[PDB]
Amino acid sequence: FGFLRLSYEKQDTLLKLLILSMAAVLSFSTRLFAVLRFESVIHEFDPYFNYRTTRFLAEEGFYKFHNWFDDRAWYPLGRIIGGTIYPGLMITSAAIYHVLHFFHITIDIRNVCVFLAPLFSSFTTIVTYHLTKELKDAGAGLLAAAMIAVVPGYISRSVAGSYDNEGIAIFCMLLTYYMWIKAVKTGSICWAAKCALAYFYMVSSWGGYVFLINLIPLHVLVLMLTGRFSHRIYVAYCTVYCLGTILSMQISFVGFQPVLSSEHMAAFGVFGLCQIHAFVDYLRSKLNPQQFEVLFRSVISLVGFVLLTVGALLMLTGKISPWTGRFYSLLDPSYAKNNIPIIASVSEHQPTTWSSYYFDLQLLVFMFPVGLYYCFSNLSDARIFIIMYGVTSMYFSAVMVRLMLVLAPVMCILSGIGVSQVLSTYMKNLDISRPDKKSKKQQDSTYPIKNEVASGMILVMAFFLITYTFHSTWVTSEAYSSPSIVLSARGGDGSRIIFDDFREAYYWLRHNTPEDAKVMSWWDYGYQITAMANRTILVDNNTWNNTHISRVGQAMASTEEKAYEIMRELDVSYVLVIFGGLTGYSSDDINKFLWMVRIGGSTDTGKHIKENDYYTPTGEFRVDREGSPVLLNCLMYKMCYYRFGQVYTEAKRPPGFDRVRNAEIGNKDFELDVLEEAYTTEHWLVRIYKVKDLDNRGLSR
Amino acid sequence: LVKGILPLVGMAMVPALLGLIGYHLYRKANRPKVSKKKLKEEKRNKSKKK
Amino acid sequence: METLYRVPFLVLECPNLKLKKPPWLHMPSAMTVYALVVVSYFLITGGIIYDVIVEPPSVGSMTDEHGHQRPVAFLAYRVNGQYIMEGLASSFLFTMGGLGFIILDRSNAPNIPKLNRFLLLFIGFVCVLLSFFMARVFMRMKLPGYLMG
Amino acid sequence: SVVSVISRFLEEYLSSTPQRLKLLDAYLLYILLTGALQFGYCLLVGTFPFNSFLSGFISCVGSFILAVCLRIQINPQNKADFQGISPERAFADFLFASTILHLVVMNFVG
Amino acid sequence: MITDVQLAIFANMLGVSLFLLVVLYHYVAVNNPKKQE
Amino acid sequence: VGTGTSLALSSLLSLLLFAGMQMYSRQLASTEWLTIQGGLLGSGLFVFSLTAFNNLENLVFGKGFQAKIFPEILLCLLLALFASGLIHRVCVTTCFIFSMVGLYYINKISSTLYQAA
Numbered sequence A: 001f002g003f004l005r006l007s008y009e010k011q012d013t014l015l016k017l018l019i020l021s022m023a024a025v026l027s028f029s030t031r032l033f034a035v036l037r038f039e040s041v042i043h044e045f046d047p048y049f050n051y052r053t054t055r056f057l058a059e060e061g062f063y064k065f066h067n068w069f070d071d072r073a074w075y076p077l078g079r080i081i082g083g084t085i086y087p088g089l090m091i092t093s094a095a096i097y098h099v100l101h102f103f104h105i106t107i108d109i110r111n112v113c114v115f116l117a118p119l120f121s122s123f124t125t126i127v128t129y130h131l132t133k134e135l136k137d138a139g140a141g142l143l144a145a146a147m148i149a150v151v152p153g154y155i156s157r158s159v160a161g162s163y164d165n166e167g168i169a170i171f172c173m174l175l176t177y178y179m180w181i182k183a184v185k186t187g188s189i190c191w192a193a194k195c196a197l198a199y200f201y202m203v204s205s206w207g208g209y210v211f212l213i214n215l216i217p218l219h220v221l222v223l224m225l226t227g228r229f230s231h232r233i234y235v236a237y238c239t240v241y242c243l244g245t246i247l248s249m250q251i252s253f254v255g256f257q258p259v260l261s262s263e264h265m266a267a268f269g270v271f272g273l274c275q276i277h278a279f280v281d282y283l284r285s286k287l288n289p290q291q292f293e294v295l296f297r298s299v300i301s302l303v304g305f306v307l308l309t310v311g312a313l314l315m316l317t318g319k320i321s322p323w324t325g326r327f328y329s330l331l332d333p334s335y336a337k338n339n340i341p342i343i344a345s346v347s348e349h350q351p352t353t354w355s356s357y358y359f360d361l362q363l364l365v366f367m368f369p370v371g372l373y374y375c376f377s378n379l380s381d382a383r384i385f386i387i388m389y390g391v392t393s394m395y396f397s398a399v400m401v402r403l404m405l406v407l408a409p410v411m412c413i414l415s416g417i418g419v420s421q422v423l424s425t426y427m428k429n430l431d432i433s434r435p436d437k438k439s440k441k442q443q444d445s446t447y448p449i450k451n452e453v454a455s456g457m458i459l460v461m462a463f464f465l466i467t468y469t470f471h472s473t474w475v476t477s478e479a480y481s482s483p484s485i486v487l488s489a490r491g492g493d494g495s496r497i498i499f500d501d502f503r504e505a506y507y508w509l510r511h512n513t514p515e516d517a518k519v520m521s522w523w524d525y526g527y528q529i530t531a532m533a534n535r536t537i538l539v540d541n542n543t544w545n546n547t548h549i550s551r552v553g554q555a556m557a558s559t560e561e562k563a564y565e566i567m568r569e570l571d572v573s574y575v576l577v578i579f580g581g582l583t584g585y586s587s588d589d590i591n592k593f594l595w596m597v598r599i600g601g602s603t604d605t606g607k608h609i610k611e612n613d614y615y616t617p618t619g620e621f622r623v624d625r626e627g628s629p630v631l632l633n634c635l636m637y638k639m640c641y642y643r644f645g646q647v648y649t650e651a652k653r654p655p656g657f658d659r660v661r662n663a664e665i666g667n668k669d670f671e672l673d674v675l676e677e678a679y680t681t682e683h684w685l686v687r688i689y690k691v692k693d694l695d696n697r698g699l700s701r
Numbered sequence B: 001l002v003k004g005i006l007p008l009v010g011m012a013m014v015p016a017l018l019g020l021i022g023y024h025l026y027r028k029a030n031r032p033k034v035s036k037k038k039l040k041e042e043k044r045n046k047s048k049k050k
Numbered sequence C: 001m002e003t004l005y006r007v008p009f010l011v012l013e014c015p016n017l018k019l020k021k022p023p024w025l026h027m028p029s030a031m032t033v034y035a036l037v038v039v040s041y042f043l044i045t046g047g048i049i050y051d052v053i054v055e056p057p058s059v060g061s062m063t064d065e066h067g068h069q070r071p072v073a074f075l076a077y078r079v080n081g082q083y084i085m086e087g088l089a090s091s092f093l094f095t096m097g098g099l100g101f102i103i104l105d106r107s108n109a110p111n112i113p114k115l116n117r118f119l120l121l122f123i124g125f126v127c128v129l130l131s132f133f134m135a136r137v138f139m140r141m142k143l144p145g146y147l148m149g
Numbered sequence D: 001s002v003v004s005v006i007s008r009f010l011e012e013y014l015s016s017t018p019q020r021l022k023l024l025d026a027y028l029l030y031i032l033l034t035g036a037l038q039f040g041y042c043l044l045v046g047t048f049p050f051n052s053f054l055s056g057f058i059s060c061v062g063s064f065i066l067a068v069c070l071r072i073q074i075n076p077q078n079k080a081d082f083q084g085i086s087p088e089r090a091f092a093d094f095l096f097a098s099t100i101l102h103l104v105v106m107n108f109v110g
Numbered sequence E: 001m002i003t004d005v006q007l008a009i010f011a012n013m014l015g016v017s018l019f020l021l022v023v024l025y026h027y028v029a030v031n032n033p034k035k036q037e
Numbered sequence F: 001v002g003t004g005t006s007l008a009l010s011s012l013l014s015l016l017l018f019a020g021m022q023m024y025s026r027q028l029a030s031t032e033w034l035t036i037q038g039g040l041l042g043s044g045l046f047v048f049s050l051t052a053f054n055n056l057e058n059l060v061f062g063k064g065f066q067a068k069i070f071p072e073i074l075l076c077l078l079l080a081l082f083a084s085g086l087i088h089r090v091c092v093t094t095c096f097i098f099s100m101v102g103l104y105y106i107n108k109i110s111s112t113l114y115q116a117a
Ligand SMILES: [C][C]([C][C]/[C]=C(\[C])[C][C]/[C]=C(/[C])[C][C][C]=C([C])[C])[C][C]OP([O])(=O)OP([O])([O])=O[C]1O[C]([C][O])[C](O[C]2O[C]([C][O])[C]([O])[C]([O])[C]2[N]C([C])=O)[C]([O])[C]1[N]C([C])=O
Pocket: A046, A084, A085, A086, A207, A208, A209, A210, A211, A214, A215, A266, A325, A326, A327, A330, A342, A343, A396, A403, A541, A542, A543, A544, A545
């Protein structure tokens, strides 16, 4: 009876604190699997670029970082780092780092970046509970926080060591929505100002800000069509638009896109419409209805013609830029595949399958409709926005696998609402929990089993919830805990053997080559080489220049003599290629060879390169004796398979066999006229060749 | 016997347990509403006893 | 200009035109929109968009020592690859599970007959339990090591 | 006739408007005149410098919209819609928003 | 340092307990008389 | 004129226009002006087809049957558009535009003739 004597207000608050506190602990802890199993290192290719920038900003100061121009990348063109980057992620890391040192807590910058992502996941959990509470109740909010904490889809990009923009982008997005919902619901300017400020913070953090600037106009427009438009909506939306537009423009990278791009036009159009709608209502109330029709018709005819002419003129003249390639694809799926090879090339741009949805979300997929049904049943202005957020995310998540992360937040909140409704309804069905007010007479004799029905329904729901935890734990441990830079292989004895070839090659270059040497490689590895090798590179992941990449592709795909001519022009010193045949590493260059062929031929200079030439007469890509003659004599084939014919990969297979393609190389013996072997890793994962100079005697090489 | 039969006991015991629970629920649901008319007859005899 | 159109109608009988808004064309009801969304959800989770871009076969083929072409429904060992038949079959299960709860909720309403209430409950549990349990089997076949440690 | 309608509309408006509300309308007219005049200059003299023109023009619109929001919140007719908001609270928010607007336009004015 | 096996068991235990507590919160919340007052 | 004769006359005029359009389709699409000429022909086909459809409806279901926007008007417009596509894609804009302009006046003509009477 000790718990009973406490006031109910005490009981509710105490449980609320305990549930939220635990959820934060779980969110942070679950992301440490990689750091424990493997070394505390930066993961993936993109994060390294952020890591290098973060160090430069902290050591050099903000002002120097703002104007930083990097000459070590995209040689000889160069890149302007200050104006082509998003500063949000770097600024947050630097600011915390300064504070910790200020108190004499000396921590490495590398540690700060590695552990930045888990901490924010805990912050995201708190924001989720408040946003859900506003829509329905506290009970739903506690459910949402639990689901968001362990959702695998969010975990994939937020694991410890994943220093990527996505880690902070999600938290900013939820906060901005939470401010927006309060701004509309309360109708207060103060909330509107807070919402705009949060929006600006997101704009710096990520490049995905565009999604928000279109969804919010869409929500307002639907309310107008449905007749729910009110003074509160006018103040909240209009106030945010003005401050948000100016704030976003401050970022150097965004520049003038908000006012000149066709991407941001939707927000501008809705803003103009709101003024017209508000003014018309004010006139109607003051004026006599009979007269009002005469003025109303005359005004519409004159204004409508003027507005239509202005809009047509802007589009036709081309003052407003057409949509960017990246966004056009997201809408029209076919456009990217048929028109832009580079966008198709990326491996996270593929459409999503059913297996992907279940693997990332599991139970939530079952519960997503239930949340939708309740929201439709009880229509509210705040609720309308969440429906818009859901139904769009589903469409944009199928088109691209990467956008799954955007889907994960909406999925957790909506699924929680469905679970909350089911739990409350049946639980109060269980009279034992509450006698409350009951009438024995007219009790519905169509009912024999009240005690049993509720007990079974609650029990089954609990079973589903526990299973969700188990699935989420197993997937994260087995899927998202692998560092890309370090590869795990099993030995014959079954021991865990670690392959460190990727770093080993970088270290060799770092100390054993001239400082001014230029290294040529595929654009995939541009960030990694610069961060660790500290040597100049020709191409980078950002791929700001398509023509430069295409020229690189031509050299690799071409014959040995032609490739040499291109390389000399660019002052290439070394070439790095990754070969996985010995170890069975699937993601080698040879699999990526085809993309090189298409990209190389995309430009005018690469017209001579035809994809069909590299295939067998039957349309097959093979590296064996039956392979196309052009393929066997291309630069890439020679580099990967130089001296590889005589190596025994397997006891059960003849020498010169390639394990990953499961085929034996057709051309086993050949010599490199213009290239010499500089260094090869122990497992041959990375091979480095040095460019030979011209002939001393002038003989044709 | 354990390696061959245990899978079979898992497949057979689950239906048997579900039938047993269903039988319990059916028996509880089939509780017959005491006829209020017989209760009224008890009330009629109660007035004779008073 | 109007006379020119009259010239055919001098001999021909002019059609009687009533340019009124069609009666059936009403603003969609809130329930109507929800139904439309649900069907879309079925297709999107099914990977219809994946099918259009990648154009996989409905079913593939395999072989053994006994040889001969087994049809294949599940694309083994690659999470981001699917066949046409497999994607739709999985998607339907997801929709069914959601509906099972809604029908169960409606069953709880007061003033329902004894027979109606019992029958509705049976359907609700069957849809929910089968939909969830079956989905686990489908993944287990696609990835043999699923949830195995 | 439309011209007759405009005359009566002014006649009712002047009688029916409290002095404080009228002061807002006069202020709004001043804001609108400045913004329109700037816009005419840009299309006559040219876009350059784009940074200066955009920063100045946006400031006029921000001031105009902010005044309108105060004009609606304080109005008794709309008191029910903005439940729980006293006139004092509305004014304090309006000043706070204005301060932010001046600062951001300040960065991009040059 | 903790091994990965220990971390995995820890994650499972906390999650299961937390979800059950949220169910318990639902119990008290409906059971609350003042919520209906 | 008699309703039965009127139905046949409208059908004959529409049929003749369609056959001519296909026969000279290659020539019509050769030049922009010729494609515009196709637009006039397609609209005329739409007008005659609509007249025939109403006449047929009156005979089968009794005199005075009223044509609706759907499906009587929509179907006639769709058939004319389909013929336009065969010659060239470009007409679908012009061929459609002429049909709409004719439709508004034809409705104006019908209202005066029938509603006034
Ligand atoms: C995608 C994302 C976004 C999100 C959004 C959304 C979903 C929304 C949609 C829309 C809408 C409108 C909706 C609504 C509706 C209606 C109205 C109806 C984002 C993405 O991210 P990012 O950042 O991009 O990522 P990454 O990828 O990493 O990035 C990188 O990469 C890219 C590629 O992909 C690139 O790009 C580039 O850019 C440049 C600029 O400078 C240019 O020049 C080029 O061209 C390009 N390229 C390509 C290939 O595209 C980028 O840039 C990068 N990034 C950086 C930062 O740098």
